[PDB]
Design a protein around this ligand. Structure first.
Ligand SMILES: [Fe+3]
Ligand code: NA
Ligand code: NA
Ligand code: NA
Ligand code: NA
Ligand code: NA
Ligand code: NA
Ligand code: NA
Ligand code: NA
Ligand code: NA
Ligand code: NA
Ligand code: NA
Ligand code: NA
Ligand code: NA
Ligand code: NA
Ligand code: NA
Lengths: 107, 107, 107
């Protein structure tokens, strides 16, 4: 039991009597609202969810102005600097054979 | 003065004569459009805003394919590498008692 | 050929017979659905696209709980730690005149 508006059985909007609203097409793209969430569904394999005071994307590449986050959750900025791969020059040292570990970043 | 469509006083859409469109439920989830913004409101404590050629989320955890941004704006990738906490091995040095500071990342 | 709902020629929704749905105002804010995408258009110069199992924002600053990504795709956390600018202390070394390069981050 809901109200449904549809054009040619291809494009739809539905409003139910309990807090659910859905806009969708037969291809499976959807924009949903429920009592506690907003969800954008991409039929090609992505979903953006706002629920519980959190925001989640799960899918393929996220691109924010050229900064990228892979499907595996690794980040590289638009210049190619990877959070998980980057290195730093360290100047002003004596060379030798030992290894030390840096501290966390300044700031 | 606006047009309102509502099902059972639970689900709503409104269109005004000035550029404002709202889709919402009584629980307080909302999708709003104004003359200069699109806003997704999560009643559980989150908001995503597109306005002024900028995009802002303010709320709890942001999760992008397993990479996380805390409510405080600190980032950790899906492997646990924190932008603000990570360290690096530094090989090929002589040990001693001094501290140096690295340069910014290569790349 | 589509169905259009409009209030005062200022606020609009359209549903076509092929999978396209659009909600928009004369100011140029838009929420679009197509057979394979969802697009939020900010007339002030931003666009968020879900398509092909990917999510893209292209525009000005992205702010996620105080962490920022510039229009150029560089990231700084809410404490000012830049992925592309940060440095690390390196303790326990002998000073000298040489440069070494760190390894990638631990973790
Ligand atoms: Fe580093
Ligand atoms: Na990448
Ligand atoms: Na990984
Ligand atoms: Na790198
Ligand atoms: Na510490
Ligand atoms: Na800082
Ligand atoms: Na985290
Ligand atoms: Na903090
Ligand atoms: Na870390
Ligand atoms: Na520099
Ligand atoms: Na690079
Ligand atoms: Na910044
Ligand atoms: Na740049
Ligand atoms: Na920094
Ligand atoms: Na490696
Ligand atoms: Na780790």
């Amino acid at each position: 039991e809901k109200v449904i508006i549809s054009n040619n059985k291809q494009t739809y909007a539905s409003f139910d009597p309990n807090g659910n609203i859905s806009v969708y097409n037969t291809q499976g793209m959807k924009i949903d609202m429920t009592p506690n969430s907003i969800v954008l569904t991409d039929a090609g394999g992505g979903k953006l969810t706002l629920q519980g005071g959190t925001m989640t994307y799960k899918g393929g590449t996220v691109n924010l102005n050229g900064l990228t986050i892979t499907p595996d959750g690794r980040m590289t900025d638009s210049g190619g600097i990877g959070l998980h791969t980057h290195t730093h020059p360290v100047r002003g040292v004596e060379t030798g054979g030992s290894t030390v570990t840096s501290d966390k970043p300044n700031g």
